Amino acid sequence: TRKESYAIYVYKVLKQVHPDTGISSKAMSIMNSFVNDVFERIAGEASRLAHYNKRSTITSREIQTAVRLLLPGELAKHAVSEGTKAVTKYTSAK
Amino acid sequence: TRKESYAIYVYKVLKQVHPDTGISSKAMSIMNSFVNDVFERIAGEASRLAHYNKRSTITSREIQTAVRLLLPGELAKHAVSEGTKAVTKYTSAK
Amino acid sequence: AKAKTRSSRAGLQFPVGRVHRLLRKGNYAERVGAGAPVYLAAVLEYLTAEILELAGNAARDNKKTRIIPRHLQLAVRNDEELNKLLGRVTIAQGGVLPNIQSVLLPK
Amino acid sequence: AKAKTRSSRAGLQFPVGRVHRLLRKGNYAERVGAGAPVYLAAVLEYLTAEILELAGNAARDNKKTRIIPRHLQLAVRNDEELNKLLGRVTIAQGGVLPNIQSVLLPK
Amino acid sequence: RHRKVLRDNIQGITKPAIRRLARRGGVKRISGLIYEETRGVLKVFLENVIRDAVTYTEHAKRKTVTAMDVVYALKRQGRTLYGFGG
Amino acid sequence: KVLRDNIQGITKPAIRRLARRGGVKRISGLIYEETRGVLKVFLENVIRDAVTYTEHAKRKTVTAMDVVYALKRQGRTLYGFG
Amino acid sequence: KPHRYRPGTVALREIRRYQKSTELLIRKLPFQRLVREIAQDFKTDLRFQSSAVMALQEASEAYLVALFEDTNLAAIHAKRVTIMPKDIQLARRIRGER
Amino acid sequence: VKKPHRYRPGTVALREIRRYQKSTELLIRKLPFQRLVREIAQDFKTDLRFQSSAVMALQEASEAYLVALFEDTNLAAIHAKRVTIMPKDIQLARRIRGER
DNA sequence: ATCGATGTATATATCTGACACGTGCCTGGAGACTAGGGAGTAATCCCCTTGGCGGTTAAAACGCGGGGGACAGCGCGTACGTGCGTTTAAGCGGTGCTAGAGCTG
DNA sequence: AGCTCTAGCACCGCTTAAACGCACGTACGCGCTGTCCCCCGCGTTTTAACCGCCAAGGGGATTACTCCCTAGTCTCCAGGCACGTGTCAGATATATACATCGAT
């Protein structure tokens, strides 16, 4: 069988933010759990925001509200910008 | 328009347990909110128990495990006892 | 044939059908078994019956024929197990339990 | 035509397709929008980038080029804001801060 | 809809009101430094609740902070509130 | 094989060292007793959820997945074991 | 010769009087002004339902009475009877709000 | 009678208060914790098995609980103008969290 | 104030097993496609929030007195901590066993 | 239901540093006693919360319309994961320099 994770992706992100740093396998597991938990939180509040408004879709607005909800502070001012630029790229690429 | 509520059911529960006692509207809404909150908690735990066992169907055993997790102490034993006698009555009456 | 509700088939007074519909619409799982609504309704009846019984006892202790939300707070906070269940839960119009620390009491 | 992965169209290092499949199979809603997996992959990538940025800073302060979950604990906990997000989180082999109270120091 | 730019309303929660709120909790004497720390922590808690409440409003494209949004915002912080629909 | 008691197995210098990891200077004589008590009740609470998680899946061993999942339900997520 | 009670008696009397009452200890209109002041810098020209305002009333009152009970426990642990701002900070920071 | 060189009570405590907070090794011995986990899971049923990673996660989580509770206990102790901890500090730290 | 041992840290080399890299391979992401109803918009009614007025009056604010209660200081004394010596069981390794996970049907 | 086989479990030896008990001393807990200032309860005084009435009209809610958008199906291939190989950085060990704490 095969098991699905986020190890190579966090390795690529660490490589592009730091070209000369290594990382342990325990940290592979911790990043896997952290990415899974943050995804679970954001998707769960996306579902809750859908169910509160009688909404059958989860668009970028629900995820934007969820990112403004879970994360407080300046990351709330950061992660709603960066992801916005992401879809700003996507609408220029589709 | 009409909004669904558990008002008359917990009202007849009150009439069954205290036949000479009425209810107030604020306490009625508090009990409705309690019913919705416990329903959401147990259904969410059952959803987690199904998803974590690679299971797609919520059976009576799902909610039995969920109420064994959530309700602490002797209420768990009376809850599983009343649930088991309810489901055996349901199967026997079918 | 004659229609006959599943709540009476289970010997149950919260509705089977409403719990089944909110289980399907609640997006908890793709499929919901037959025993799931009756079991969950039985659990809901047990919790509602316990809290209503304790509230009725507290109202008899206060001597009114009405459950005020103060009686609901007194019902759910005097029982240790229900206190552990509804620990992070605020009930409106409830106040607090009338407790005083023994250090504060003079004699 | 030649297939291009949606993460590269979004300019992202995190998979759009895997996140979209998990949103479908997590059964959060009946439908999932087009830009929502892109946006969620972007916020996951930003959080991962910040946490590994702080991990690399802590590792360079420790002068250890491969990061340890100790360096991760110094990364998460010393940040004044990221500690609030991971407040109810225990990091395995994480440890605590080397903090000493001012009264506890010798006179 | 705001009639005027309100400011310095933290004194609206008066020292006697703080004294009752302490009395319900079961404390005998109150120091003079309590009455501003209590206002500060009250301000912090209300800011934390109302930020989530107004995000719930702006997701719904509304202008009115309804009771349901406040209920869900308080549920988000782990303090579930009953009596307002739920 | 049934173990009689190993509450005393939690070593008194081990509690001293855990408290020193907590950042304390001095330890009272009763701390070794109520620390064992709170550790016992916490392990009771976690292990009960772990065993009922395992019983849900028709399994008769306890995995790290179920321990982490019980800790997640309890309110303290654990990263490092999936 | 007035009927001046001993300070430390009528405080407990009104402790018992308030602990059996469900009346709102914070007046409605100062809390209106405070809620509008807090919500002003998040979006200008916001409106509030009265039931939402009552939700703020009850949640705020419950949070404050729970915090004051915890600080009372922290004060009586510290061989004192009067609560102090250090009790406030200690209860909040053990609770994890800081 | 001469006496050997020795430290004040508390300064080697600070030397290892710095030494023990810079490391991340597990503090409880592995076998007694495993035996305790096996004996707690007995009234649930007998003949239950634990993976080594399960016992590892349990020990790490319990040590995290004890270190957080001991920071809160030392903070309650320093609130009461004391440098050592007391049992009633432990029940205070449990009572403020609402889990006693 | 000064000097000394004890302790932690700094530096260089050897050594090793986890991690970095590569390769084969296949599930699942991607492109194309149609269809349906959810979604966005406009038109509409109308509950309900804001706003103002007036009077009532409960209550906030104010200053006063005085005495617990906070808190600094002191002394005493039990209970810590630190240490040496001894004891002991964890820790480590290999061996041997099969229950029981785990996958397929 | 059933085969495969990981790994949990049982054990046994020896090396091992902690675990253990005890001996000596002192900083620290606890209580007393001190000053005193801090707050509580008071009437007097004063502000505004409160009721309720009326009214303006924004804004949430419903109804209706139509259309872009996403599940769904189908085909296809490359990114992704298991597997394998081998450096190489961290652990280990020894020698060297500096500094906190003790007490001359």
Numbering used by the authors:
A (entry chain h), B (entry chain d): 29 to 122
C (entry chain c), D (entry chain g): 12 to 118
E (entry chain f): 17 to 102
F (entry chain b): 20 to 101
G (entry chain e): 37 to 134
H (entry chain a): 35 to 134
Extract from the study:
We then determined cryo-EM structures of the reconstituted PIC–nucleosome complex in the absence (complex A) or presence (complex B) of nucleoside triphosphates (NTPs) under the conditions of our transcription assay. Complex B was resolved at an overall resolution of 4.0 Å, with local resolutions of 3.4 Å for Pol II, 3.6 Å for the nucleosome and 3.9 Å for TFIIH. Comparison of the structures of complexes A and B shows that the +1 nucleosome is rotated by roughly 75° in the presence of NTPs. This rotation is apparently caused by the translocase activity of TFIIH subunit Ssl2 that hydrolyzes ATP to propel downstream DNA into the PIC. The observed roughly 75° rotation would thus correspond to a DNA translocation of 2 bp toward the active center of Pol II, and this is reflected by an observed bending of the DNA duplex into the cleft of Pol II around the initially melted region. The transition from complex A to complex B also led to a further detachment of nucleosomal DNA from the histone octamer. In the absence of NTPs (complex A), only one turn of terminal nucleosomal DNA (SHL–7 to SHL–6) is detached from the histone octamer surface, whereas in the presence of NTPs (complex B), two turns of nucleosomal DNA are detached (SHL–7 to SHL–5). In complex B, however, TFIIH forms four contact sites with the nucleosome. TFIIH subunits Ssl2 (XPB in human), Tfb2 (p52), Ssl1 (p44) and Tfb4 (p34) all contain charged loop residues that protrude toward the nucleosome in complex B. The Ssl2 ATPase domain engages with downstream DNA, whereas the Ssl2 N-terminal extension and clutch domains form a wedge between DNA and the nucleosome. This Ssl2 wedge stabilizes the two detached turns of nucleosomal DNA.
The preinitiation complex (PIC) assembles on promoters of protein-coding genes to position RNA polymerase II (Pol II) for transcription initiation. In the yeast Saccharomyces cerevisiae, PIC assembly occurs adjacent to the +1 nucleosome that is located downstream of the core promoter. Here we present cryo-EM structures of the yeast PIC bound to promoter DNA and the +1 nucleosome located at three different positions. The general transcription factor TFIIH engages with the incoming downstream nucleosome and its translocase subunit Ssl2 (XPB in human TFIIH) drives the rotation of the +1 nucleosome leading to partial detachment of nucleosomal DNA and intimate interactions between TFIIH and the nucleosome.
